[PDB]
Subunit: 161 residues, 8 copies
């Protein structure tokens, strides 16, 4: 029941995107926590969250942010855990500022970055699941079933009417 | 000594970038294989490589490509393993084509994407290490040392 | 009656764009098939479709995809037929990710790329028609008539009221 | 020995790029002509070239241009033949201006667009070959060989 | 009464933008003609329009186009008159394809390019007026009055209520 | 011999670009002046230059600037003369900042914008010439000759 | 009561953005003036405003503009005061033209640039406040309280219902 | 001689850019400190530096970073002082990643951002000077002289 993934985001406005990560983890029966951590308004909260994540039993952090999106990178600065970053779509620049701010981490401090928006949030959860599946056989079986069903469920032709 | 990370790239020209991933894994003593697999020129080679990766004992795949960079995404299509993608810098568009081709995966098939170029290759290896460290205590300790040395080695002032 | 063009796309959401290719082929009386083939969820379906296209009698493949748009390029990897790619407009990046993912094929494996969106789909069908017209006199005459009528139908002045 | 593909470009400076199309067609023994035609400096030359291409026996036109790259689109305006466009890399904008000027054709007048630069020129020639192969069995066999050799020649591992 | 400026555009859809050029010329009492000329569907119409513009008494051409916007550049290829180009906003790429397709004319064949959209159309007309004013004293006086009034009409403070 | 075109630029570094405008005007025997005027470092110099241009007998101003390129727009703010703007290629952003800063003028104050770099400088001079040709028959004839020679001099095939 | 910050913008349309700077200054009890100054239509008004700002007692200028956004840079050309620039979002290019036109000032004439849009306007006011706080103890205390409250007010978790 | 401006940067490689800020402050005789602080490799060093800056007597912080450039924003998160950000030019994306990562701060935590590269570093120092000049009359006079000399030194015509 203890969380093994932490989903963090800077604002309530990010939840519309990050809820897709939350939903997927629940679907795959991966215990997790969901929190707001703002890199710019609560930097000490971030430092403490990231520093202590491993000792609290977290294995993966999924962090979403938009604009000058510093939350994933600063999380990775303080934790040795894998950090996955979700660029949240921004109003003016459509998430391009979010994307570049997250993915372009200089060498030495990684953030595994997913697509802009809801797709990225879903895939961050799936990527987290595939990491956890490496050392959890029951989850690995659930993930295999999930991927197989996704493949089997693709229609053969469009509805052209 | 059986590999647990696979590093794959589309061509010899990608090696100038992907060698940084190889060097990092060797530094952390993570057994790995380093191969050329081209999504466009050797698609069947890719299918076989990705489909069999898990049964061969690989845990993570690091895939580098430039331009219309399809290697990481198509690898992820055939494996349940985590796939990490490195956008190789392209001549004209400086890896922006590489980056968008890799990171903008549809929901359902993830690629964890790193920075354009050598930084991304180094970070893909470190991210692979941080994944393996979750279930390998000796490696977790070496990764802790690596990160601690990185932090401690930053100078306090520039040399003028 | 056997199809000589295959129109393929990754999702039902692509049909709003790809239907314009379908309509134009029908207008020019070019027999064709329309299918969903998702490069990422059904990669073996794609491999089989592309590998066997020539022996099935297809002459041209029109492939549409958005985002990390890999369907046209991977189709071309497996077929010796000409493959035409239509970038489908994406939500955040307005099809720029689609366009670059399709057009920037490194040397050795071509995809002839058309404009982002509905215009591109229509033109992929017209380009396919112009290819087929090289060795089909009746179609060449229909295409000539079509192009001539397009030219003759352009108004001389705008409705300025 | 009558040409069936026309390769046209706006200037001598484009030749560094378009020579890759020329070389590929020669390798596949596809008879072709290689000419300079500038949409902006020689518009009447372009009109005549494009309007008469089909009656001269051309089957495909490959057109390369950079910057405000109008040559492929205007060629397509005057011919019913398939026109393939190669964006030549520009000095400032690295061929992004070339690419958008060529690929964003209005519905009704297509240009099949290839990658920026030398890769695009090579691929325009290969795409022209794949078109001609549909109704030339000997060429189809040579193209099959070309693609098979490309696939088989990819090394399995990088040289370190 | 004979036209001294020609306003040309490729489609009726361009009129929503180009009407602002038309309105400004009329305001400044500059006789002009407004026509549809599509570079891609009616290339011979374009060649004839541009070739004969000077002998027909035109002094300036204002050409608007979007997407792969070739109309202004090809007009300039055939006329020695100054050609002013208006990038029409495009759906996916917001006129960036229009802008680059028009402004990036290689050396030897100029197009004086204005802003994307309605502002650009208005300014093309104003630029045309400033060209004509160099050798028409009555128009020069009207343009001076117009510019002076524009300056005098700027409010001193925003309505902040 | 009184100047009828003014070429202005913000710094000596712009001269590598703007010299192409100067050369073209000299070739067409259009009397002109070539000056440094910086919108940011010498704003009063700019105000005076632009406000007095018409009374000094200038007909067209060609203004080149890079980066946050404000020189053409601010020139146009103070003169009723046509102002043509040349985006100078910038180091980092390759003149895209220059281009947008110049071309995106608000309705009411036009700048006729040319291509990034040397091509734009040459074309600003040619556009100035085409404006002057409307009311100078001898110049119109020289411009006709210039354009005819440009067209006739394009080779028919590349040199291999 | 005399103003120590000037907020200037080129048009009434900019007020929807710049009002956020106005509101924040008022919240922090910083006396200020708000004016329209258009760099292109009223360049002499701009020259006079900027030249005389220091002698009028202003300490900081906040200037907002969109498109070819020259107002902040030209203000800085004429004043020795710090000038802060707010890129106003533009219709076609989403404020990217605004941003590059403001931030890319060559060396020698600075404009401190904030984010595109309302966030940038709010932050220009906050940056102005942090400048004034260096030599106004009462304001420094109000700003400290404001920043502390911002930090304390961040929720711990999203509303996930 | 106690520093009133802090110049910080993530690495030695940033010094080629940030030295221009250092030189300008020295020219205006503004006491300052120049340090390496990396947001990603030394985050605790950053937290301590920023949190204590005001109590140490700093008035302005100038922070330079490239790529995913987080140093200025995170500095601003911990200090009430004005923070000025310099986007360092990155290899692939020419500082566009640097620029967007720095300038697009959320409302509530400002970074005053300057141009990409050396120009931005020089201007961050000048902007810091203009801030300090508000409450230091001798410095205000030196800054007036600096700006006056800049203006007066612009040549009237290019050297050909
Ligand atoms: Cl290092
Ligand atoms: Cl090769
Ligand atoms: Cl030449
Ligand atoms: Cl200097």
């Amino acid at each position: 029941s203890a969380p093994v993934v932490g989903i963090i985001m800077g604002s309530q406005s990010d939840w519309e995107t990050m809820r897709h990560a939350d939903a997927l983890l629940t679907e795959l029966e991966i215990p997790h926590e969901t929190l707001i951590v703002c890199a710019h308004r609560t930097p000490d909260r971030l430092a403490d969250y990231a520093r202590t994540a491993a000792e609290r039993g977290l294995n993966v952090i999924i962090a979403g942010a938009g604009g000058a999106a510093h939350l994933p990178g600063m999380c990775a600065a303080w934790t040795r855990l894998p950090v996955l970053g979700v660029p949240v779509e921004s109003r003016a620049l459509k998430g391009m500022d979010s994307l570049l701010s997250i993915v372009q981490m200089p060498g030495g401090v990684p953030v595994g970055t997913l697509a802009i928006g809801a797709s990225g949030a879903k895939n961050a959860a799936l990527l987290a699941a595939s990491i956890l599946a490496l050392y959890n056989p029951a989850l690995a079986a659930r993930l295999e079933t999930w991927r197989a069903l996704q493949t089997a469920s693709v229609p053969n032709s469009p509805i052209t009417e």
